[PDB]
Short mmCIF file of N, CA and C in Angstrom, two decimals:
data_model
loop_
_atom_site.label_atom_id
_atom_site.label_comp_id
_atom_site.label_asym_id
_atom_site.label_seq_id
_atom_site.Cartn_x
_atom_site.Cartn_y
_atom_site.Cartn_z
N UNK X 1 90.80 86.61 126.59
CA UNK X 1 92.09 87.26 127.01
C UNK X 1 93.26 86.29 126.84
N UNK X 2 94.50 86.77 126.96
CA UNK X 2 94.79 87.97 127.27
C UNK X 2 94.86 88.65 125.35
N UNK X 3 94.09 90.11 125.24
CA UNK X 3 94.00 91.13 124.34
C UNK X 3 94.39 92.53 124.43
N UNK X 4 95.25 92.59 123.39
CA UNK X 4 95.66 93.78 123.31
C UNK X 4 96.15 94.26 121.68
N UNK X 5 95.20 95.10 121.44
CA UNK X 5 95.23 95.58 119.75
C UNK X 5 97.03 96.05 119.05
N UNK X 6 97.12 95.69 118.28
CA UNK X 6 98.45 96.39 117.97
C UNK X 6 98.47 97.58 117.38
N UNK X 7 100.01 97.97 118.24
CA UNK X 7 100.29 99.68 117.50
C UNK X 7 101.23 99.50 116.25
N UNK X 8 100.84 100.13 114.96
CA UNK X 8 101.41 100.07 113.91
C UNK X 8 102.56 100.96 113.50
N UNK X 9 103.59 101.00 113.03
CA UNK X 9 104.50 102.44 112.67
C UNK X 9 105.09 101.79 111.30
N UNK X 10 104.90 102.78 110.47
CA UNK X 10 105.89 102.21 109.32
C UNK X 10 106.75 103.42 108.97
N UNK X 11 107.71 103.22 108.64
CA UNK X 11 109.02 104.29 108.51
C UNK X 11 110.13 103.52 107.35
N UNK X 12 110.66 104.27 106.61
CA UNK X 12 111.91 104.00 105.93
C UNK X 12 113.18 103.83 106.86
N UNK X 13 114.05 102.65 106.60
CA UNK X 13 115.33 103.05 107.05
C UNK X 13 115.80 104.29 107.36
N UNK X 14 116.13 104.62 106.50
CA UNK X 14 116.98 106.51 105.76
C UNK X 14 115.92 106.97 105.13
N UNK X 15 116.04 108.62 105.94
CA UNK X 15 115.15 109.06 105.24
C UNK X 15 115.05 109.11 103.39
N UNK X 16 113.67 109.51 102.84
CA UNK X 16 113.49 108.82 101.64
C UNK X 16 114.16 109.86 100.21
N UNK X 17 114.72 109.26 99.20
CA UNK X 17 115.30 109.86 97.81
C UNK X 17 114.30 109.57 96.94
N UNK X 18 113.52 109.70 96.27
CA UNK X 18 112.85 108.59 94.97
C UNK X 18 114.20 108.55 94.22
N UNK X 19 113.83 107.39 94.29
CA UNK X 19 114.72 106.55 93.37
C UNK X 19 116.32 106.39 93.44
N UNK X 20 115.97 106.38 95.25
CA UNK X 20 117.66 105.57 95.76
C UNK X 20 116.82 104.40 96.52
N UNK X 21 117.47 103.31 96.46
CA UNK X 21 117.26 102.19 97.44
C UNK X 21 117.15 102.75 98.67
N UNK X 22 116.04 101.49 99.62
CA UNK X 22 116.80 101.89 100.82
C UNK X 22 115.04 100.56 101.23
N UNK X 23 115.15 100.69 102.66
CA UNK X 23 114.57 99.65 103.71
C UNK X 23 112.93 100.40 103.90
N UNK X 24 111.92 99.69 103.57
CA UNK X 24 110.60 100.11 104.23
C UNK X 24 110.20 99.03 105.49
N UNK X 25 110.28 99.48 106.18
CA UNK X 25 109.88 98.69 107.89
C UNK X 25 108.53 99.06 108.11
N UNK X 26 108.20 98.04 108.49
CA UNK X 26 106.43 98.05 109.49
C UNK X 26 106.51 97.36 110.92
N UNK X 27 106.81 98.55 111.58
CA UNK X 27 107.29 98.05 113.35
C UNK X 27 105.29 98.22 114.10
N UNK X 28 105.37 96.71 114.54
CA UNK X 28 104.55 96.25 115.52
C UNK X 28 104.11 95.79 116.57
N UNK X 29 103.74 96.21 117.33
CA UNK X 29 104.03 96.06 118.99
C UNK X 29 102.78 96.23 119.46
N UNK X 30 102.78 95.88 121.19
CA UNK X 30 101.70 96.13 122.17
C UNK X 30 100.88 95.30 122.32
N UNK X 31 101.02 94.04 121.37
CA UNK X 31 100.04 92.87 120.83
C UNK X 31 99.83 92.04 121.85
N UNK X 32 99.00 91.26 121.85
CA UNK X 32 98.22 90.30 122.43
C UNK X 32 97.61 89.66 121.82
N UNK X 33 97.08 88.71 121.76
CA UNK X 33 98.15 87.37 121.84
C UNK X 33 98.75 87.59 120.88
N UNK X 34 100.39 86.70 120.81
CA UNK X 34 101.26 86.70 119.50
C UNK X 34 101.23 86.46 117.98
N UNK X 35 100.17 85.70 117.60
CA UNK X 35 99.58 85.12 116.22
C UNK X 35 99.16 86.40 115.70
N UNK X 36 99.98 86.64 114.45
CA UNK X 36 99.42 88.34 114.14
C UNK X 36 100.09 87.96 112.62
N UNK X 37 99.58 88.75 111.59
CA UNK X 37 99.96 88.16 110.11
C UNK X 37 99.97 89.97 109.44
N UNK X 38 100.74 89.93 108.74
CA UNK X 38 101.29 91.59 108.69
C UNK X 38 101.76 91.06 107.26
N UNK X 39 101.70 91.88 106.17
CA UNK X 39 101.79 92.09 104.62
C UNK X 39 102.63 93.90 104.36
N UNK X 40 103.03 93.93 103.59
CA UNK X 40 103.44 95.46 103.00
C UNK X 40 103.03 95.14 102.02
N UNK X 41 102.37 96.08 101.42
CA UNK X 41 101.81 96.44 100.13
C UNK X 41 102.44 97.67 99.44
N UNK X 42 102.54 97.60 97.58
CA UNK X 42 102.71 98.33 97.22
C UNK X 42 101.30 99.23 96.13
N UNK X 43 101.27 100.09 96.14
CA UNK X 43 99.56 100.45 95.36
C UNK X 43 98.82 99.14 95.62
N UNK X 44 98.72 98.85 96.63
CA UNK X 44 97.27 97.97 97.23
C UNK X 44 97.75 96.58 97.09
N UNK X 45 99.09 96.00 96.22
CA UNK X 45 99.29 94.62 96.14
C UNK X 45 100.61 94.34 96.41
N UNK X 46 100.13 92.78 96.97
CA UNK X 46 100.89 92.38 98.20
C UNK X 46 102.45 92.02 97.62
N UNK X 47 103.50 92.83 98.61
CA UNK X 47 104.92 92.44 98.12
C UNK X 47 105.65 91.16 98.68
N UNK X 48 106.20 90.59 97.88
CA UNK X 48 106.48 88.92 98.17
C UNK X 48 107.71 89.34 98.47
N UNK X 49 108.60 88.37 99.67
CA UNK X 49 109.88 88.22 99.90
C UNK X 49 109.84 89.69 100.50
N UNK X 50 108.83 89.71 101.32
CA UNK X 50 109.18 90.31 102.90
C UNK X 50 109.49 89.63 104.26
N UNK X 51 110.54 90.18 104.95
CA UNK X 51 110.92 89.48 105.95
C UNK X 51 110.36 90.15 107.45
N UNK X 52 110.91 89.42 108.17
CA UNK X 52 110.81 90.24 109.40
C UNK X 52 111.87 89.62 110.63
N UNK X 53 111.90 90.49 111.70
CA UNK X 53 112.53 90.59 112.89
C UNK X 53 112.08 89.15 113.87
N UNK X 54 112.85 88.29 114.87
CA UNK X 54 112.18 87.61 115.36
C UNK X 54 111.42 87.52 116.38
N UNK X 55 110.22 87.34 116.58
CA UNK X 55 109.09 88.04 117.61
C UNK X 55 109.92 88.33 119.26
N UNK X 56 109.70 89.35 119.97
CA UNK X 56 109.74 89.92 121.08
C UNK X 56 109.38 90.17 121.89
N UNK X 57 109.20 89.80 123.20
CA UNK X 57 108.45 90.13 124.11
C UNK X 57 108.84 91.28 125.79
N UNK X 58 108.39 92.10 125.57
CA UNK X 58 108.89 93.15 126.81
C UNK X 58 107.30 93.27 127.95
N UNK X 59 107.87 93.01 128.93
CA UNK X 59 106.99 93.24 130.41
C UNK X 59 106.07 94.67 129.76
N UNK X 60 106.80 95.43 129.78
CA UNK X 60 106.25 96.89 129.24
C UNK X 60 105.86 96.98 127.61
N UNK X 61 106.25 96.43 126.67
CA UNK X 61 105.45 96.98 125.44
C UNK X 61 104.91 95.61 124.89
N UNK X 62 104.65 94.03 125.34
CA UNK X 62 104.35 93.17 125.25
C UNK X 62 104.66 92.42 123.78
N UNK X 63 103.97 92.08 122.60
CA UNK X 63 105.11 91.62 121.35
C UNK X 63 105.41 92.36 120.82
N UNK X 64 106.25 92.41 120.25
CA UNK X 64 106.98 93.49 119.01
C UNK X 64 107.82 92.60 117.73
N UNK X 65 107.84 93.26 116.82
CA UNK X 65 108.53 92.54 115.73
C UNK X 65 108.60 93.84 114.43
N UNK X 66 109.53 93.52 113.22
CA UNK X 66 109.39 94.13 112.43
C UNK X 66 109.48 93.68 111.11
N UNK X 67 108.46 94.05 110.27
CA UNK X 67 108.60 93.64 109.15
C UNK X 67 108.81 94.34 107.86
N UNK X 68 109.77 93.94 107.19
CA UNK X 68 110.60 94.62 106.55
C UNK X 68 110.81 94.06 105.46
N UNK X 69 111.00 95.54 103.70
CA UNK X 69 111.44 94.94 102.44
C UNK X 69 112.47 95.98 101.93
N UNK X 70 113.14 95.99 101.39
CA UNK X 70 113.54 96.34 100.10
C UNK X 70 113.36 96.94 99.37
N UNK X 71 113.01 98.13 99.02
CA UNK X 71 112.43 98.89 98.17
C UNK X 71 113.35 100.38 97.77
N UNK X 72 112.27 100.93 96.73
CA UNK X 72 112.86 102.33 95.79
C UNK X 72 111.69 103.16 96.32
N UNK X 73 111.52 103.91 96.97
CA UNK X 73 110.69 104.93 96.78
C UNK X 73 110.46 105.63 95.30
N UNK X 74 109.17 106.07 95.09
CA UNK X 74 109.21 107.05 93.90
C UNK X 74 107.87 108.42 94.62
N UNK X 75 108.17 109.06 93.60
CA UNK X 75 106.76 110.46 93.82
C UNK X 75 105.27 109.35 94.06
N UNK X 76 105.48 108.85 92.96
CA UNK X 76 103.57 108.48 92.74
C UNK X 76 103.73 106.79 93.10
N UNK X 77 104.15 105.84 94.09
CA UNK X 77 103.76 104.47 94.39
C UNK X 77 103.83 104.89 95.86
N UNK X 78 102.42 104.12 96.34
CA UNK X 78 101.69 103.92 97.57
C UNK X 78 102.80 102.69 98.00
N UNK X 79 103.04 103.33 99.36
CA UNK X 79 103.58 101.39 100.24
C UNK X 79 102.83 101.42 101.42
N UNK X 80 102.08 100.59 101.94
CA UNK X 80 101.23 100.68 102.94
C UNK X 80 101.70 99.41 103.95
N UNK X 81 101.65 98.73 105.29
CA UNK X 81 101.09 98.15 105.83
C UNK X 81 100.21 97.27 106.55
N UNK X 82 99.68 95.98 106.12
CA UNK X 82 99.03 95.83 106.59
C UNK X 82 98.85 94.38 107.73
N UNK X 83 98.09 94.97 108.66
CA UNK X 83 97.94 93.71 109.99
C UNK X 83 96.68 93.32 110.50
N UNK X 84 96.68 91.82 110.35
CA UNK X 84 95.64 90.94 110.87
C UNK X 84 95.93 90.58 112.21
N UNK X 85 94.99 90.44 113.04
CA UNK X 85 94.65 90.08 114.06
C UNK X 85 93.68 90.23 114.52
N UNK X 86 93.47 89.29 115.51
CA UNK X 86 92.34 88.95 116.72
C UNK X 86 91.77 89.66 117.06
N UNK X 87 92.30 90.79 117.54
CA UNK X 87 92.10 92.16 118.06
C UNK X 87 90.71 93.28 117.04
N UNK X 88 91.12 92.73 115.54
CA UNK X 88 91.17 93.96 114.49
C UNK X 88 89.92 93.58 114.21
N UNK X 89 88.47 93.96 113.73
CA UNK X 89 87.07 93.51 113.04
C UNK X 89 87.82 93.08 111.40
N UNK X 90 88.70 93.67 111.31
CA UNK X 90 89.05 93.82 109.85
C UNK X 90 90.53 94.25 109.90
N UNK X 91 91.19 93.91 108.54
CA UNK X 91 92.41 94.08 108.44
C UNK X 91 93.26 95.61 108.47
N UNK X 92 93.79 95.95 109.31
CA UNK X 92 94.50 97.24 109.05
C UNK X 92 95.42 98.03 108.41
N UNK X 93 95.13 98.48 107.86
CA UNK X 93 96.65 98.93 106.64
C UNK X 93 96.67 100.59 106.63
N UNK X 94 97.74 100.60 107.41
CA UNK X 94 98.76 101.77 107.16
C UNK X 94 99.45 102.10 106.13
N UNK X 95 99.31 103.57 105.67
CA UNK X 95 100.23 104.01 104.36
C UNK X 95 101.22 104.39 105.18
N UNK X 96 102.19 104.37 104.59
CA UNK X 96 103.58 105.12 104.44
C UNK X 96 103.50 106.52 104.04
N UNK X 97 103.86 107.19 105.26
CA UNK X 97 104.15 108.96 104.96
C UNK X 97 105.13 109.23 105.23
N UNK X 98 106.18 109.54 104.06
CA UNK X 98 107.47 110.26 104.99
C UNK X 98 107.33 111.50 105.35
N UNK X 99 106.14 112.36 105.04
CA UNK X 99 106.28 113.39 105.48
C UNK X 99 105.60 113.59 106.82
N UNK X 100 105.93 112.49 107.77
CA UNK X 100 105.39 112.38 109.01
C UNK X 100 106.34 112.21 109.65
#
């Protein structure tokens, strides 16, 4: 202890155009302990010169942070999510649905 698995959300800035710019975010929270390693992927490979938010801590939703790139949406490229931790047997990766 202290453990607590993280909750994943990934969302666009603005909702999505193919092929207008705009922000893909991977918001992460609820974590325990803080050491947590998080990637965005595009069709399965890893996008370089992603940033993120600086870690956070709330009584009520415990760490949070966000990590965030740059991107174009199109019809047919996958952007997924993904987070390591303590918590996880294995690495977790979330796709990106805007139609969620």
């Amino acid at each position: 202890m202290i453990q607590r698995t993280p909750k994943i959300h990934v969302y666009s800035r603005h909702p999505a155009e193919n092929g207008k710019s705009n922000f893909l975010n991977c918001y992460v929270s609820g974590f325990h302990p803080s050491d947590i390693e998080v990637d965005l992927l595009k069709n399965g490979e890893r996008i370089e010169k992603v940033e993120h938010s600086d870690l956070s801590f709330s009584k009520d939703w415990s760490f949070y942070l966000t990590y965030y790139t740059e991107f174009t949406p199109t019809e047919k490229d996958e952007y997924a999510c993904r987070v390591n931790h303590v918590t996880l047997s294995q690495p977790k990766i979330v796709k990106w649905d805007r139609d969620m």
